[PDB]
Design a protein around this motif. Structure first.
Motif, PDB file in Angstrom:
ATOM      1  N   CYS A  20      -2.897   0.661 -10.089  1.00  0.00           N
ATOM      2  CA  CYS A  20      -1.666   0.517  -9.327  1.00  0.00           C
ATOM      3  C   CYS A  20      -0.967  -0.805  -9.679  1.00  0.00           C
ATOM      4  CB  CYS A  20      -1.984   0.586  -7.830  1.00  0.00           C
ATOM      5  SG  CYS A  20      -0.582   0.155  -6.755  1.00  0.00           S
ATOM      6  N   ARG A  21      -1.713  -1.903  -9.670  1.00  0.00           N
ATOM      7  CA  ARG A  21      -1.165  -3.161 -10.146  1.00  0.00           C
ATOM      8  C   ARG A  21      -0.619  -3.032 -11.565  1.00  0.00           C
ATOM      9  NH1 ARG A  21      -4.903  -8.056  -9.258  1.00  0.00           N
ATOM     10  NH2 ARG A  21      -6.318  -6.615 -10.355  1.00  0.00           N
ATOM     11  N   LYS A  22      -1.353  -2.351 -12.430  1.00  0.00           N
ATOM     12  CA  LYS A  22      -0.901  -2.203 -13.807  1.00  0.00           C
ATOM     13  C   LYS A  22       0.430  -1.462 -13.849  1.00  0.00           C
ATOM     14  CE  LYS A  22      -2.438   0.909 -16.946  1.00  0.00           C
ATOM     15  NZ  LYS A  22      -1.392   1.151 -17.989  1.00  0.00           N
ATOM     16  N   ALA A  23       0.539  -0.351 -13.132  1.00  0.00           N
ATOM     17  CA  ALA A  23       1.794   0.393 -13.092  1.00  0.00           C
ATOM     18  C   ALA A  23       2.928  -0.462 -12.588  1.00  0.00           C
ATOM     19  CB  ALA A  23       1.612   1.637 -12.209  1.00  0.00           C
ATOM     20  N   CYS A  24       2.695  -1.179 -11.498  1.00  0.00           N
ATOM     21  CA  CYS A  24       3.729  -2.014 -10.913  1.00  0.00           C
ATOM     22  C   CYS A  24       4.197  -3.108 -11.851  1.00  0.00           C
ATOM     23  CB  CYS A  24       3.227  -2.577  -9.596  1.00  0.00           C
ATOM     24  SG  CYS A  24       3.086  -1.295  -8.294  1.00  0.00           S
ATOM     25  N   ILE A  25       3.246  -3.748 -12.527  1.00  0.00           N
ATOM     26  CA  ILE A  25       3.614  -4.789 -13.494  1.00  0.00           C
ATOM     27  C   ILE A  25       4.403  -4.162 -14.651  1.00  0.00           C
ATOM     28  CG2 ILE A  25       2.681  -6.534 -15.078  1.00  0.00           C
ATOM     29  CD1 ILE A  25       0.574  -7.153 -12.930  1.00  0.00           C
ATOM     30  N   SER A  26       4.032  -2.954 -15.073  1.00  0.00           N
ATOM     31  CA  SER A  26       4.760  -2.211 -16.108  1.00  0.00           C
ATOM     32  C   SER A  26       6.201  -1.978 -15.707  1.00  0.00           C
ATOM     33  CB  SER A  26       4.124  -0.842 -16.386  1.00  0.00           C
ATOM     34  OG  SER A  26       2.875  -0.935 -17.037  1.00  0.00           O
ATOM     35  N   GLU A  27       6.441  -1.892 -14.387  1.00  0.00           N
ATOM     36  CA  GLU A  27       7.754  -1.642 -13.808  1.00  0.00           C
ATOM     37  C   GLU A  27       8.486  -2.931 -13.428  1.00  0.00           C
ATOM     38  OE1 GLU A  27       7.702   1.511 -10.706  1.00  0.00           O
ATOM     39  OE2 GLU A  27       5.764   2.081 -11.546  1.00  0.00           O
ATOM     40  N   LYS A  28       7.934  -4.068 -13.850  1.00  0.00           N
ATOM     41  CA  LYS A  28       8.546  -5.388 -13.651  1.00  0.00           C
ATOM     42  C   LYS A  28       8.464  -5.902 -12.225  1.00  0.00           C
ATOM     43  CE  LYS A  28      11.664  -4.338 -17.449  1.00  0.00           C
ATOM     44  NZ  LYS A  28      11.556  -2.878 -17.077  1.00  0.00           N
ATOM     45  N   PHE A  29       7.484  -5.417 -11.476  1.00  0.00           N
ATOM     46  CA  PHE A  29       7.080  -6.051 -10.245  1.00  0.00           C
ATOM     47  C   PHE A  29       5.984  -7.047 -10.575  1.00  0.00           C
ATOM     48  CE2 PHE A  29       9.419  -3.423  -7.247  1.00  0.00           C
ATOM     49  CZ  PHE A  29       9.641  -2.260  -7.970  1.00  0.00           C
ATOM     50  N   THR A  30       5.563  -7.833  -9.591  1.00  0.00           N
ATOM     51  CA  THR A  30       4.557  -8.841  -9.840  1.00  0.00           C
ATOM     52  C   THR A  30       3.162  -8.432  -9.355  1.00  0.00           C
ATOM     53  OG1 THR A  30       5.230 -10.110  -7.897  1.00  0.00           O
ATOM     54  CG2 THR A  30       6.197 -10.750  -9.966  1.00  0.00           C
ATOM     55  N   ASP A  31       3.062  -7.400  -8.524  1.00  0.00           N
ATOM     56  CA  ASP A  31       1.767  -6.886  -8.087  1.00  0.00           C
ATOM     57  C   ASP A  31       1.944  -5.460  -7.589  1.00  0.00           C
ATOM     58  OD1 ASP A  31      -1.067  -7.172  -7.545  1.00  0.00           O
ATOM     59  OD2 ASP A  31      -0.607  -7.278  -5.402  1.00  0.00           O
ATOM     60  N   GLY A  32       0.819  -4.772  -7.419  1.00  0.00           N
ATOM     61  CA  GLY A  32       0.775  -3.518  -6.707  1.00  0.00           C
ATOM     62  C   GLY A  32      -0.487  -3.445  -5.885  1.00  0.00           C
ATOM     63  N   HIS A  33      -0.411  -2.811  -4.716  1.00  0.00           N
ATOM     64  CA  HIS A  33      -1.561  -2.575  -3.868  1.00  0.00           C
ATOM     65  C   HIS A  33      -1.488  -1.180  -3.270  1.00  0.00           C
ATOM     66  CE1 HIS A  33       1.531  -3.653  -0.989  1.00  0.00           C
ATOM     67  NE2 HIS A  33       0.809  -3.036  -0.075  1.00  0.00           N
ATOM     68  N   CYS A  34      -2.606  -0.710  -2.734  1.00  0.00           N
ATOM     69  CA  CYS A  34      -2.660   0.604  -2.098  1.00  0.00           C
ATOM     70  C   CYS A  34      -2.393   0.505  -0.614  1.00  0.00           C
ATOM     71  CB  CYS A  34      -4.024   1.250  -2.290  1.00  0.00           C
ATOM     72  SG  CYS A  34      -4.531   1.497  -3.990  1.00  0.00           S
ATOM     73  N   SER A  35      -1.612   1.449  -0.085  1.00  0.00           N
ATOM     74  CA  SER A  35      -1.466   1.557   1.372  1.00  0.00           C
ATOM     75  C   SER A  35      -2.666   2.308   1.948  1.00  0.00           C
ATOM     76  CB  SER A  35      -0.144   2.212   1.742  1.00  0.00           C
ATOM     77  OG  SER A  35      -0.154   3.595   1.475  1.00  0.00           O
ATOM     78  N   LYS A  36      -2.878   2.168   3.253  1.00  0.00           N
ATOM     79  CA  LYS A  36      -4.098   2.701   3.858  1.00  0.00           C
ATOM     80  C   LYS A  36      -4.004   4.149   4.282  1.00  0.00           C
ATOM     81  CE  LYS A  36      -5.003  -0.575   6.898  1.00  0.00           C
ATOM     82  NZ  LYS A  36      -4.395  -1.909   6.627  1.00  0.00           N
ATOM     83  N   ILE A  37      -2.826   4.600   4.710  1.00  0.00           N
ATOM     84  CA  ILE A  37      -2.746   5.887   5.366  1.00  0.00           C
ATOM     85  C   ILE A  37      -2.180   6.964   4.449  1.00  0.00           C
ATOM     86  CG2 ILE A  37      -1.837   7.149   7.354  1.00  0.00           C
ATOM     87  CD1 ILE A  37      -4.179   5.131   7.887  1.00  0.00           C
TER      88      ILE A  37
END
Length: 47
Positions: A20-37
């Motif tokens: 998820c972090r990798k995808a987000c960084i690929s999209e020019k965000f700085t991090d990615g995390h998982c939501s719980k629900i």
């Protein structure tokens, strides 16, 4: 101040951070995390 935007390229439900972090960084965000629900990959970047 950071804003959350669901990843547009991450496939499937978000269980572990690394792909998820990798995808987000690929999209020019700085991090990615998982939501719980809904278990979405949420990208974050300054806003």
């Amino acid at each position: 101040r950071e804003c959350k935007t669901e990843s547009n390229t991450f496939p499937g439900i978000c269980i572990t951070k690394p792909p998820c972090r990798k995808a987000c960084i690929s999209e020019k965000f700085t991090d990615g995390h998982c939501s719980k629900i809904l278990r979405r990959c949420l990208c974050t970047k300054p806003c």
